[PDB]
Design an enzyme around this catalytic site. Structure first.
Site, short mmCIF file in Angstrom:
data_model
loop_
_atom_site.label_atom_id
_atom_site.label_comp_id
_atom_site.label_asym_id
_atom_site.label_seq_id
_atom_site.Cartn_x
_atom_site.Cartn_y
_atom_site.Cartn_z
N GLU A 125 0.80 -1.16 0.23
CA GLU A 125 0.04 0.01 -0.11
C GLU A 125 0.92 1.39 -0.09
O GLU A 125 1.96 1.30 0.80
CB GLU A 125 -0.92 -0.02 1.09
CG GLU A 125 -1.81 1.20 1.21
CD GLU A 125 -2.39 1.51 2.66
OE1 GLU A 125 -2.12 0.83 3.56
OE2 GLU A 125 -3.07 2.41 2.74
N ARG B 249 6.32 -12.91 9.26
CA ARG B 249 6.95 -11.55 8.88
C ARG B 249 8.48 -11.48 9.63
O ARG B 249 8.55 -12.17 10.67
CB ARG B 249 6.27 -10.27 9.26
CG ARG B 249 5.38 -10.40 10.74
CD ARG B 249 4.59 -9.12 10.76
NE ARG B 249 5.11 -7.88 10.70
CZ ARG B 249 4.74 -6.71 10.03
NH1 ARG B 249 3.61 -7.11 9.32
NH2 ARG B 249 5.27 -5.54 9.76
N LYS C 209 5.30 0.53 9.53
CA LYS C 209 5.30 1.87 8.66
C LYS C 209 4.76 3.02 9.72
O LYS C 209 5.19 3.90 9.92
CB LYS C 209 4.33 1.83 7.49
CG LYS C 209 4.78 0.89 6.18
CD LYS C 209 4.49 1.61 4.96
CE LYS C 209 4.19 0.53 3.87
NZ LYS C 209 3.23 -0.26 4.16
N1 LIG Z 1 -2.05 -9.97 1.22
C1 LIG Z 1 -1.39 -9.14 1.54
O1 LIG Z 1 -0.16 -9.35 1.54
C2 LIG Z 1 -1.99 -7.78 1.85
C3 LIG Z 1 -1.53 -6.57 0.88
C4 LIG Z 1 -1.35 -5.14 1.66
N2 LIG Z 1 -1.58 -4.31 0.74
C5 LIG Z 1 -0.39 -5.06 2.49
O2 LIG Z 1 0.08 -5.72 3.31
N3 LIG Z 1 0.44 -3.98 2.04
S1 LIG Z 1 1.84 -3.59 2.69
O3 LIG Z 1 2.41 -2.49 2.05
O4 LIG Z 1 1.59 -3.50 4.27
O5 LIG Z 1 2.90 -4.64 2.63
C6 LIG Z 1 2.98 -5.38 1.40
C7 LIG Z 1 3.64 -6.92 1.66
O6 LIG Z 1 4.61 -6.81 2.66
C8 LIG Z 1 4.24 -7.97 3.56
N4 LIG Z 1 4.96 -7.42 4.82
C9 LIG Z 1 4.74 -6.45 5.44
N5 LIG Z 1 5.57 -6.27 6.66
C10 LIG Z 1 6.16 -7.29 6.56
C11 LIG Z 1 7.38 -7.99 7.29
N6 LIG Z 1 7.64 -7.25 8.44
N7 LIG Z 1 7.72 -9.01 6.70
C12 LIG Z 1 7.59 -9.64 5.73
N8 LIG Z 1 6.56 -9.40 4.92
C13 LIG Z 1 5.87 -8.03 5.39
C14 LIG Z 1 2.68 -7.97 3.42
O7 LIG Z 1 2.33 -9.35 4.13
C15 LIG Z 1 2.45 -7.64 2.30
O8 LIG Z 1 2.46 -8.76 1.37
#
Ligand SMILES: NC(=O)CC[C@H](N)C(=O)NS(=O)(=O)OC[C@H]1O[C@@H](n2cnc3c(N)ncnc32)[C@H](O)[C@@H]1O
Length: 529
Positions: A27, A253, A263
RNA sequence: GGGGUAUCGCCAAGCGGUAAGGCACCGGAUUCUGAUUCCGGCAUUCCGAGGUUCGAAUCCUCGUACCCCAGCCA
């Protein structure tokens, strides 16, 4: 190989799929962090290994949180990491008219209705983690009523929060997500892609599965916190006329010791000006790590090393450091630079100076050699000279001699302190032909360099667990020193990392380095025990 | 209440045949970077307790710890 790849393999084998199509759906509400890179290497990594495609979709369903500055930085980071997306950059907005039509289908199918329950009321009706929720009094409106009301909503006839489109599922479901989830909500805010064409926007759960279906994703890979959401994901697709049904799989994650990975928190550091910005070298952001001196390769290696599982985890700083050290140790050319300079004048030296030979890499002669100027007035690190102690101390002692890197063997015999007792200069004597070790820089041929020494942003291993994570910021996360470097670094460019002898790996940029005063970021120091 | 995870200090292989690897740590050999490289060491047991089998980290039962879900955020 990991669990996700095993499922993929099993699918290929069983003939459920003939190709793999993944996606990275961030996002645009902030910059990307080392965590998102894990996702990036997982999704794009899988696609290229299986000769498939991977889209870069911006999940832009909440206008008020997103911004155009973010889409551009997200695109830059993905490319910088060395991954290419399939076709053009996709946008959830691209499916807005589509999503709208699908909502209408649900309405005609009696599976969605317009709810008048206020934003407060909806929660009160929702139930709790242990008590089932209750049906809204508007849940039984006719298909015609809802159709009109939804259009009323679309037409902007209702104020923000005055109505919403909800799915008609089960208010007594153990899954809280399935208790009549909101499909659409009213937001009279300009969208960075669709301008002011829309006043109603689709919710993540309604959007995401349909976006994946339309794009023909085979395996939607997300993190663990969406496991409950899969129920809604499948519900939506199972209730609309759509030819494909992508399957969601969740992996844990990434969490890094001494830094926060949301974020939300990272944005607070930027907004409150506790860091220069999103790209600050202390930030665990991709751009920040980039400006810090980290190579895209080192990052892909880190992702490779940490793995992909369902176990919660917190990686230690030493793991990331090992990756960048491995890379740079092998490629970064060595040099001379002094952080804490104290003049050391060789009284035994006649003339103005000479030029010595120095390998661009001691263990790799194929990288070449350079000609560095030597003289009677040089600069050395204050940590190198000591009038006292320990047989282990291999550096310059007040009654001993020490080999200067790729040069002669000096020998301090007289020192000069001041009123507070601080040494200003160390008078020594060099051997005619002698070519513990220490680095140095000729005072005459010295380049005024600003050196920035970085450290863990936070004082504690898990700052995110602190009541006020800000109050636990390390005050010494940045320590700007002023030193001297050999004239070679004059031609140093931003992007390449040089390994300063006995100090660590450094690089230009800093977003501050000018022509007069070059600024160098310490990507990471060398191993010292 | 529902959904998930338990293997070394931190990660992680393992998928009934007898505990990989990485980061880290402990030794010894080199080095004009206390770096690099470099040989040598590091869980007789896998959250716990019963059960099954010739054999279990893997199967079974009861327990325990932690993580996620009550935004018209993602
Ligand atoms: N089905 C999904 O993946 C949800 C998508 C959503 N727009 C979203 O999560 N957006 S985001 O900007 O927050 O992050 C995008 C992708 O990164 C992953 N993500 C976010 N934080 C993460 C972390 N700490 N470790 C690993 N992966 C992580 C999210 O799952 C998404 O796929």
């Amino acid at each position: 190989t990991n669990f996700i790849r095993q499922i993929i393999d099993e699918d290929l084998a069983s003939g459920k799929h003939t190709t793999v199509h993944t996606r990275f759906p961030p996002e645009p509400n902030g910059y990307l962090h080392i965590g998102h890179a894990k996702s990036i290497c997982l999704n794009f990594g899988i696609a290229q290994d299986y000769k498939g495609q991977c889209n870069l979709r911006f999940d832009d369903t909440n206008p008020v949180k997103e911004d155009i500055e973010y889409v551009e930085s997200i695109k830059n980071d993905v490319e910088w990491l060395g991954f290419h997306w399939s076709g053009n950059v996709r946008y959830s907005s691209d499916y807005f008219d589509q999503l709208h039509a699908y909502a209408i289908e649900l309405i005609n199918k009696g599976l969605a209705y317009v709810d008048e329950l206020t934003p407060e009321q909806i929660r009160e009706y929702r139930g709790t983690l242990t008590q089932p929720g209750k049906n809204s009094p508007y849940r039984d409106r006719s298909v015609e009523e809802n159709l009109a009301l939804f259009e009323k909503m679309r037409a902007g006839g209702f104020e923000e929060g005055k109505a919403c489109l909800r799915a008609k599922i089960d208010m007594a479901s153990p899954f809280i997500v399935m208790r009549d989830p909101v499909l659409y909500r009213i937001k009279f805010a300009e969208h960075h892609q669709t301008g002011n064409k829309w006043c109603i926007y689709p919710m993540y759960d309604f959007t995401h599965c349909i976006s994946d279906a339309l794009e023909g994703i085979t395996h939607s890979l997300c993190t663990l916190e969406f496991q409950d959401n899969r129920r809604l994901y499948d519900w939506v697709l199972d209730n609309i006329t759509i030819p494909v049904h992508p399957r969601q799989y969740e992996f844990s994650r990434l969490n890094l010791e001494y830094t926060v990975m949301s974020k939300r928190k990272l944005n607070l550091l930027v907004t409150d000006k506790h860091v220069e910005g999103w790209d600050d070298p202390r930030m665990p952001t991709i751009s920040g790590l980039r400006r810090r001196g980290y190579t895209a390769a080192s990052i892909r290696e880190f992702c490779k090393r940490i793995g992909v599982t369902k176990q919660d985890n917190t990686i230690e700083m030493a793991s990331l450091e090992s990756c960048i050290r491995e890379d740079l140790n092998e490629n970064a050319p060595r040099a001379m630079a002094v952080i804490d300079p104290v003049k050391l004048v060789i009284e035994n030296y006649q003339g103005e100076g000479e030029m010595v030979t120095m390998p661009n890499h001691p263990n790799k002669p194929e990288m070449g050699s350079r000609q560095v100027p030597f003289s009677g007035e040089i600069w050395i690190d204050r940590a190198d000279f000591r009038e006292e102690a320990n047989k282990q101390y291999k550096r310059l002692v007040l009654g001993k001699e020490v080999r200067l890197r790729n040069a002669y063997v000096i020998k301090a015999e007289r020192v000069e302190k001041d009123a507070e007792g601080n040494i200003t200069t160390i008078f020594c004597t060099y051997d005619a032909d002698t070519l513990g070790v220490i680095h140095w820089v000729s005072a005459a041929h010295a380049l005024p360099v600003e050196i920035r020494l970085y450290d863990r942003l936070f004082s504690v291993p898990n700052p995110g667990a602190a009541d006020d994570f800000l109050s636990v910021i390390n005050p010494e996360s940045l320590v700007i020193k002023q030193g001297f470097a050999e004239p070679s670094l004059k031609d140093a460019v931003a992007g390449k990392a040089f390994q300063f002898e006995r100090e660590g790996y450094f690089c230009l940029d800093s977003r501050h380095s000018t022509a007069e005063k070059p600024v160098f970021n310490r990507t990471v120091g060398l191993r010292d025990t």
